[PDB]
Design a protein around this ligand. Structure first.
Ligand SMILES: O=C1NC(c2ccccc2)=N[C@@]12O[C@H](CO)[C@@H](O)[C@H](O)[C@H]2O
Ligand SMILES: O=C1NC(c2ccccc2)=N[C@@]12O[C@H](CO)[C@@H](O)[C@H](O)[C@H]2O
Ligand SMILES: *Cc1c(COP(=O)(O)O)cnc(C)c1O
Ligand SMILES: *Cc1c(COP(=O)(O)O)cnc(C)c1O
Lengths: 806, 806
């Protein structure tokens, strides 16, 4: 149909049809009279998966022959989404499969919707891991993603009476055709026990054994015939009254049962620590086994381990344990190897998110690792003492061990000490690390600290989710940009091209019609497709300030009511996201959003000027639908709180304008497109600090802004909760007395800036010209650029766009 | 190689090799440089499974078109064993696959050994279900096996220091290629709740829901291109703090987690009752759904439900519940349908094995079913009262409800009342049912009571496990006997044929050499292959009198020691079996067996005249090895205790002579072969009763038999337990004061009879002639005969040996 989806060759199509019918008959054990649409999806999945296999086997064989340095991306989260369409795109099979399925009388798009998201992540961090895997494969790196195969990913979200309900995401119910179990690579992991010191050295004894069974999922590079591996571990009980013993095996296997959904507040839960050690222990054994199939001085020349936040920080003490206790290297040599091998990416500055494990917990579960951490801490603090003699305060601040109520291990401190490289994930965030929370460590080892601004894969996030936009771009500048996104700059030469302006606006309107229909179908309510689509989709957090958005929405409503017969640019305000299940305020915000919607969407006087929709069950596959449909991207975190963000980049790439704060990668986005092409508002980081020094008094804003005072009175008095007048008292009280994120401080500038958006939207041609200026400068935010920087500046390997043989 | 294994056609072999390599590449995702022998087994399994699929799909399609009456074999146990070889035999693919694998440089026999037993049964009852499925497919019946897919089957047995240790049988670890999940046929099962009586009728409300997900396994008939289905249900939690809720899903799924291994003593465990209801509820919904795809008056013309003992007895109240509460039939009509549909097979008379569920348990878990059982009981006892006016004692004895300490439901009583047919499983057992435990029910409804003597499938139990014996038979009389075993009588005309005598003895010696080697390899100890192979393999039970065997073995030892320099026919005594994990005495017997072995096998004076071996982990695949190797079959249960036995039949078919009591099917076996061709000894049933009336005094035997007294002194004094002198005090005490199975009463006759065995073994030619007389009359004990009798006399359908198209 469209060229960027590849060729439909006569042989190819005939072949695909033959294989499809073969899998239907032999794999599914069905005839065409009894096949459910799910059967058809599965037949297609196996058929496509068949085209991966030779490439997978040869890629892994190639790495054995060439023995390149290997990259191990260690993460607790991989937010993969659906695999079928992505696999077809990267193998150039999409048009052939569309044709082959069409000829069998099937609509491929319908079959794609049957596939479950692999929702093995919470949000940004998990998705970043998934985008990185795609880029690593595309750049021909010998890279492996290592994580946990959770039986249950992020919960499915239902709204009942405006409230979030959580449902178990039973994603494996119907089987996963993408994965291959490898029971023959099963490895023991040890817990509890105690340490004996002998003549030979320390020995970890009387441990409990849990087994780690790997499942491998293929990761295809973009049309380079490279297929890398994602290895996820599953917990299995070892095989050594009777009934209960059998049933008790469940306890060991609980380790890999369920993704922890608390992306706000670190809770030191034992099961979570078990997960962290489990993935680390199984992975390092695998790494070392592979390393030996070809003396540890060469280890860092053959192995890079990237730590996705502190979640796999125990990689550092575990590697020491294996090198010292099992391989019998002396400490210093062992340590040298560890530091040159390991590198740490920090993904937050919010202090309640930092992992600070109680010592008593580590003492019980991982006694040997605690010993090793104490030894690391001692040697580290000896280096600090030597560098800064007398600075006792510095010693306390930098210690891996935090004193107080309960002793804790600061895992971030452990990571900086045990890594040759520490990076943030946007320039402003990496600066804040060096100025504030890791200033002491920076002063000791300035050379360790880097920036690696985040990116998104243009495969999933353009070609896949927005084929029409991809096509009209390819019509002008060819297809090379898909793996070299900087080529998008060539679109600057089309900013005054009348036909390209027409094409860009047509695609957007088509995406909106498509999504408007999807709303009506799956969640039956009607929306004006000619309205401005104002979307904020991301996890629900106070710092991301969905509440600021709520205030703006109520302002528009109050203005309409006041002057009903006046023109306003009509809007559909769409807000979506999951709240962590124990995060009360986030749950109240969702409820407030739906409460506003109930009022606004049923007011006769508003009509279709204003609509407020809560998008249920925001996940990767919903993002692929709504982001192409968006006009305005809401990136309105308080300055200094969003480490980078990545949604921001998805929208830029897909033809929406951004309203946002100078936070995270927004700063670099505005810099690339020019500030005049970006709706910047609010406090800078410096402003927030100035406010904090003199003290944030929210009352001041309530007193001086009549519009704001009206909103707060409405919330209080039950305007938005008639049957429950005081439902939102927690929200008002927080906004008035305990608002860490200074919602009121940015209110005035946000509303003024939102007016400028409405003003520009009134001018289709100039809106679309501004869009082109955004799309055309979004190249920097390709994860290909990000990974190329990791490769050259941290891992010490060169990327490649050269094909492997087919 | 041998003709009964089929043809190796040039196309066939080339095809199999092609498919094998295809599955290795695409299904296993391996090349030949990294393939483990397990990969090769899996590739072969998929290849063979591919030849089942068209036949499976067409068979099920045929049943839809023809809409024959359908047989539902309801069992908690299916002891299937390995599927690969059996599938090849029944599809005639064995020689082709042997050749195809050979040419790929693989030994098929080695690949077969990688397959795990599907050990979803304890022993005789479970295996009978598996033999029945094979016969039902072979006789072209529209039959379905319905059970539970246990995650863990019968435990693996290890002997440590002579003691049984149990290990979880994790049979699904590496996947099951034989099964096909059918998640789209998932069905709810309800538990707990309470009953509301409305205007419409009774309503079962506030229940907990567990889901039942079916897995279908193909059941190929012998070269008739029929493939029936075995459907096994798996428990899955329904999909409607957070972490713990997710983890708690395990509790629902515990229902299908593990096979109950207590084949001796009924324990009223709730989890066991959950299993029984779970299989019954899911199955009846499936039955009814199928019935509707084509008014319930016709139900019994389209449906037969066979109950494998009382384990699925709740089928009767469940069917009433659905007909009355959900379909709104009146009671009488509902009842008529139920009785004409259901039929009950009894498989024991030992009173501690009968299922007698506490009322309080049923009350809580299945409140509605208890109501229905009480109504059944009332109507039933009204019929008894009318038939036998004034016989109040009869009323008490026949009640479904037993009074006493705790009220119980007698499930056997429920089965007789709710079934149109009740059968035993050997003539003597069916007589005992009518004379003793169900005499009252027989007097009421004489027409219900039948015999259906058990059988074994000659496919697994001759062709598969003993190809050489199958071949030399086929050389004389052709292959038709494999599905018509009565043809074996034609071998009577070869009893004086010198060459056939030679062939029969050669095959036996080859089987012994083969098994002797297997011992040395897998469990490193040496055995004289020219000794008489004396084997007793079966679950460890007091009633099966492994202890009597132990006494004989110690007698032979004591006789050798007394007269060391005298000739005795050398023997290898092999005893194997699992004890139920809580069955103390059975665990002591295993220990005694190994204790005897430790003494006998290390005595220099004994040499290789006598060896005692405990066969570890007796299971279906070990039976296929040891039974063809046996000379003497030990079937020595106390008269009246073994309902039938089926091991007995396996050995008869495979060229061993039987020493046994007139118990179970032994009676019919001796009758078929002639008593002069059978080593019969001991009390008849009548003798046991005469002893019981005057009282069993074991002391009497100890006083009068010096040889026996010596054995008891040895056991007591620690002759067989030096470091633990009183280890076997429980065994002695039981034998002397509390022996329900009268071991001493049969001792003298057993030893004399064992001498006659030794005497005949001394004469190879006459031994072998006697063997021929056994093999030649074993035809009756084909499960084909058994199932044909069920079909005609209970189910009301005609068997067929006609082929379906290929
Ligand atoms: O999405 C994110 N989750 C976490 C995080 C959550 C819990 C504990 C630790 C970190 N950090 C985040 O990483 C993304 C990827 O770098 C950034 O784009 C986000 O700004 C940042 O919020
Ligand atoms: O092997 C058997 N197990 C049980 C049984 C076990 C527990 C509860 C109820 C029954 N009955 C048996 O059924 C076989 C098949 O009919 C008979 O050959 C055996 O003689 C008989 O012992
Ligand atoms: C990209 C993405 C995120 C991260 O979005 P931010 O706006 O950076 O928080 C979260 N969830 C999903 C499903 C995504 O696709
Ligand atoms: C046939 C068989 C049994 C039943 O044997 P009996 O001697 O009748 O008790 C038990 N277990 C296995 C593995 C079998 O193959």
């Amino acid at each position: 149909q469209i060229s960027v989806r590849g060729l439909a060759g006569v042989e190819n199509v005939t072949e695909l049809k033959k294989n499809f019918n073969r899998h239907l008959h032999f794999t599914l054990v069905k005839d065409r009279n009894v096949a459910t649409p799910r059967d058809y999806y599965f037949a297609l999945a196996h058929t496509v998966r068949d085209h991966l296999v030779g490439r997978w086997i040869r890629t892994q064989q190639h790495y054995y022959e060439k023995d390149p340095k290997r990259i191990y991306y260690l993460s607790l989260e991989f937010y993969m989404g659906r695999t079928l369409q992505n696999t077809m795109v990267n193998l150039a099979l999409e048009n052939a499969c569309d044709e082959a399925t069409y000829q069998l009388g099937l609509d491929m798009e319908e079959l794609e919707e049957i596939e479950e998201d692999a929702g093995l992540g919470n949000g940004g961090l998990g998705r970043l891991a998934a985008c990185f895997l795609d880029s690593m494969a595309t750049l021909g790196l010998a890279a492996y993603g290592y994580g946990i195969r959770y039986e249950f990913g992020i919960f499915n979200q239902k709204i009942c009476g405006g409230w979030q309900m959580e449902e178990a995401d039973d994603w494996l119910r119907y089987g996963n055709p993408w994965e291959k179990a490898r029971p023959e690579f099963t490895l023991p992991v040890h817990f509890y026990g105690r340490v004996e010191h002998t003549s030979q050295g320390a020995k970890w004894v009387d441990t409990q054994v849990v087994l780690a069974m790997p499942y491998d999922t293929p990761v295809p590079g973009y049309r380079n015939n490279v297929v890398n591996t994602m290895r996820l571990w599953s917990a299995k009980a070892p095989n050594d009254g009777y009934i209960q013993a059998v049933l008790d095996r469940n306890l060991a296997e609980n380790i890999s049962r369920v993704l922890y959904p608390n992306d706000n507040f670190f809770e030191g839960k034992e099961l979570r620590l078990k997960q962290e050690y489990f993935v680390v222990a199984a992975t390092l054994q695998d790494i070392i086994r592979r390393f030996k199939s070809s003396n540890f001085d060469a280890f860092p020349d053959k192995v890079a381990i990237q730590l996705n936040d502190t979640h796999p920080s125990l990689a550092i003490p575990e590697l020491m344990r294996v090198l010292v206790d099992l391989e019998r290297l002396d400490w210093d040599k062992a340590w040298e190897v560890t530091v040159k091998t390991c590198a740490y990416t920090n993904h937050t500055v919010l202090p309640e998110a930092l992992e600070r494990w109680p010592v008593h917990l580590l003492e019980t579960l991982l006694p040997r690792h605690l010993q090793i951490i104490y030894e690391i801490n001692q040697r580290f603090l000896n280096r600090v003492a030597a560098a800064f003699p007398g600075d006792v305060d510095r010693l306390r601040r930098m210690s891996l061990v935090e004193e107080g109520a309960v002793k804790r291990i600061n895992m971030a401190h452990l990571c900086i000490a045990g890594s040759h490289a520490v990076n943030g994930v946007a320039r402003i965030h990496s600066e804040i690390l060096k100025k504030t929370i890791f200033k002491d460590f920076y002063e000791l080892e300035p050379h360790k600290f880097q920036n690696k601004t985040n990116g998104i894969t243009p495969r999933r996030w353009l070609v896949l989710c927005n084929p029409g936009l991809a096509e009209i771009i390819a019509e002008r500048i060819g297809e090379e940009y898909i793996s070299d996104l900087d080529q998008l700059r060539k679109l600057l030469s089309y900013v005054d091209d009348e036909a390209f302006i027409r094409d860009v606006a047509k695609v957007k309107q088509e995406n909106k019609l498509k999504f408007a229909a999807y709303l009506e179908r799956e969640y039956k309510v009607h929306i004006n497709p000619n309205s401005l689509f104002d979307v904020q989709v991301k996890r629900i957090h106070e710092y991301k300030r969905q509440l600021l958005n709520c205030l703006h929405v109520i302002t528009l409503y109050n203005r309409i009511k006041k002057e009903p017969n006046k023109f306003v640019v009509p809007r559909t305000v769409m807000i979506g996201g999951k709240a962590a299940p124990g995060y009360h305020m986030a749950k109240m915000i969702i409820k407030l959003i739906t409460a506003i919607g109930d009022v606004v969407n049923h007011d006769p006087v508003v009509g279709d000027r204003l609509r407020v929709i809560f998008l249920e069950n925001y996940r990767v596959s919903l993002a692929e639908k709504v982001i192409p449909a968006a006009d305005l991207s809401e990136q309105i975190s308080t300055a200094g709180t969003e480490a980078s963000g990545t949604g921001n980049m998805k929208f830029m790439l897909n033809g929406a304008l951004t309203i946002g704060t100078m936070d995270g990668a927004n700063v670099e986005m505005a810099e690339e497109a020019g500030e005049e092409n970006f709706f910047i508002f609010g406090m800078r980081v410096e402003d927030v600090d100035r406010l904090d020094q003199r003290g944030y008094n929210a009352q001041e804003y309530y007193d001086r802004i009549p519009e704001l005072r009206q909103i707060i009175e409405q919330l209080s008095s039950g305007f938005f909760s008639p049957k429950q007048p005081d439902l939102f008292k927690d929200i008002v009280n927080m906004l008035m007395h305990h608002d860490r994120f200074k919602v009121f401080a940015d209110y005035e500038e946000y509303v003024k800036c939102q007016e400028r958006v409405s003003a520009l939207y009134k001018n289709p041609r100039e809106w679309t010209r501004m869009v082109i200026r955004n799309i055309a400068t979004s190249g920097k935010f390709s994860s290909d650029r990000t990974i190329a920087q990791y490769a050259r500046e941290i891992w010490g390997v060169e990327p490649s766009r050269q094909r492997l043989p087919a």
